[PDB]
Amino acid sequence: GFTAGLTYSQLMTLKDAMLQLDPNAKTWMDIAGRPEDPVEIALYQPSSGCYIHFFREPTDLKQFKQDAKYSHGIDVTDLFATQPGLTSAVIDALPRNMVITCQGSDDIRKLLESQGRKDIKLIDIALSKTDSRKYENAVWDQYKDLCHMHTGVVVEKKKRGGKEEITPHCALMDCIMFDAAVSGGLNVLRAVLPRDMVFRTSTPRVVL
RNA sequence: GGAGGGAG
RNA sequence: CUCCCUCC
Ligand SMILES: [Mg+2]
Ligand SMILES: [Zn+2]
């Protein structure tokens, strides 16, 4: 009937903010979290340099906790004030019949089809782990200030020894670094959404 | 159950 | 840690 949790004022603000997108530009999307219970969400257009990055709190904290140690290293403490509903809102604003590019389209497909957008055409570059990540450290370097949200230490099976430490999976960096791979190098970036749209400024209060 | 991949 | 895909 309506769009949950967002008032009309900020919902129009959003819709205007997302008209800054070129419907026909190359458009990247990655997520952190399960498609059922996503936590981080990024969309990227290298052509303009503009991106949509925001956050959601997990409903399953158990599944979230494993995912953080072996994938994203996100501290649930840092999702503390995030716009409820934002995901459904942003997905709904995406242009009818859009073309998204991603890696491992199966997660992205599951999410969009759960938002009712079957109309969105998905292009999976279908790379390999070692190909796609080839621009990782440079992307993380030039672009570090854009995500401070992966605090955690992320690990991997060492063939000899069990845990080997790595660089975690940020929807945003992945978006950027996959483009770099598919375009053979690095492409200035601007957020489509205002900070107080993706995060509530929490105020001091008396507890009741 | 194995072989390989991919995702969080 | 957990999910997905392909193959026998
Ligand atoms: Mg992905
Ligand atoms: Zn991130």
Numbering used by the authors: 360 to 546, 549 to 569
The authors write:
The nucleoprotein NP of Lassa virus, and other members of the arenavirus family, suppresses host innate immune signaling pathways, and may be linked to the profound immune disregulation noted in Lassa Fever infection. Lassa NP has a tertiary fold that is similar to, and an exonuclease active site that is completely conserved with other DEDDh exonucleases like interferon-stimulated gene-20 (ISG-20), E. coli DNA polymerase IIIε (ε186), and Trex 1 and Trex 2. The unique digestion of dsRNA by Lassa virus NP probably removes this pathogen-associated molecular pattern, and allows the virus to replicate without strong interference by the innate immune system.
Here we present the crystal structure of the exonuclease domain of Lassa NP in complex with eight bases of dsRNA. To increase the chances of obtaining a co-crystal structure of the exonuclease domain of Lassa NPΔ340 in complex with dsRNA, E391 was mutated to alanine. As a result, NPΔ340E391A is able to bind dsRNA, but cannot catalyze the exonuclease reaction to digest it. As a result of the required mutation of E391 to alanine to prevent dsRNA digestion, only one of the two cations is present in the active site in the crystal structure (site B). This site B cation is modeled as a magnesium ion, because of the presence of 5 mM MgCl2 in the crystallization buffer, and is coordinated by D389 and by one of the phosphate oxygens of the 3′ terminal nucleotide of the digested RNA strand (G8). In particular, the 2′OH of the ribose group and N2 of the nitrogenous base of G8 hydrogen bond to D426 of Lassa NP. Further, the 2′ and 3′ OH groups of G8 form hydrogen bonds to the main-chain nitrogen of G392. The ribose 2′ oxygens of C1 and C4 of the complementary, non-substrate strand (in the sequence 5′C1UCC4CUCC3′) are bound by the side chains of Q425 and D465, respectively. In addition, the nucleotide base of C1 forms a π-π interaction with Y429. The dsRNA bound to Lassa NP remains base-paired throughout the entire length, including the final residue bound into the active site.
